[PDB]
Each structure stands twice: as C-alpha cells, then as structure tokens.
C-alpha cells in the first residue's frame, strides 16, 4: 500500500459571528497532497451542530471536493490548536475510509461547544478557532 501524508491548518476568525442556525456550514479553502493527482480536499464545520441530536456540539468533516477517480481511501486526524500553539483534543479515524467526490467523513460530535466557548480552556483566543487536519491517502 502506497501512502501520502499531508496536512492543513484552518483558522476560523470571528467565531462568535457564526449564524445561530444548525443548518449553517463553514468550509475551508481546498488543499491537496503533493502527489499531483487532481484530488482536492477541504474541511467542513457545522458550528451549531449538524442536527437536533448534535446541536450541543461542533461537527467537523473532511470532504473530498474534487476527484476524477472512482474512489480513494484515506485515514484522517483532526485537532484543535490551543492558545499556547499546541495540538489538543485530537481524534483520528483509526482506519482508512472510502471517499468519492462530494463525500465527507468525520465527527458529528467533534467537541462540545460549551467547552469550546469556556474561556479557561483557551481554544478561542481572540475569537478564533484553529483546526489542524492530517490526512494519509492511499495511492
């Protein structure tokens, strides 16, 4: 199995200005590996959760935005950058998931929002949420 590792850091500025609706989606800019294979990825966040059951959480997904092949398998890992600059609260997929164009995989309940908004945890310094994604794609 041939594997390409790559990563993306996303800073969401003005986090408290997100819309107060569970529908709302925010997406990152697209990013890619160096393998030069026409794959484009982005991150997707539901700041107020995906749906009623998850409304207390922030949801976080990896989306394969563009891919001219039938499928690609990839492992992934998300983390939050704290006010010290270190990664915290990471979660990984453990195994590789099958992506096709337009498909996303991730965590409906990535982190409870009240924890996020709790000043003492230092995860929204300056009203900014910084997320780090590591991806390992099978080539």
């Amino acid at each position: 199995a041939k594997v390409v590792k790559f990563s993306y850091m996303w800073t969401i500025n003005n986090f408290s200005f997100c819309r107060e609706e569970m529908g709302e989606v925010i997406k990152s800019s697209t990013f890619s590996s160096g393998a030069n294979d026409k794959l484009k990825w982005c991150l997707r966040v539901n700041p107020k959760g995906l749906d009623e059951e998850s409304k207390d959480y922030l949801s976080l997904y990896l989306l394969l935005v563009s891919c001219p092949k039938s499928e690609v398998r990839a492992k992934f890992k998300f983390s939050i950058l704290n006010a010290k600059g270190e990664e915290t609260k990471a979660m990984e997929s453990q195994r590789a998931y099958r992506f096709v164009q337009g498909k996303d995989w991730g965590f409906k309940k990535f982190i409870r929002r009240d924890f996020l908004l709790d000043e003492a945890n230092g995860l929204l310094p300056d009203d900014k949420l910084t997320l780090f994604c590591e991806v390992s794609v099978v080539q």
Binding site: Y57, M91, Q94, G106, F107, R112
Partner: peptide
Amino acid sequence: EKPLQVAAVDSSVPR
C-alpha cells in the same frame, strides 16, 4: 454531562 467528544466516524448526513 454529555461526552466532550464522540470518536464515532460518520458521513455528513443530518438525522
């Protein structure tokens, strides 16, 4: 009360 994070992986489909 509720877990801080749930490591269950799924695909963005609202319920």
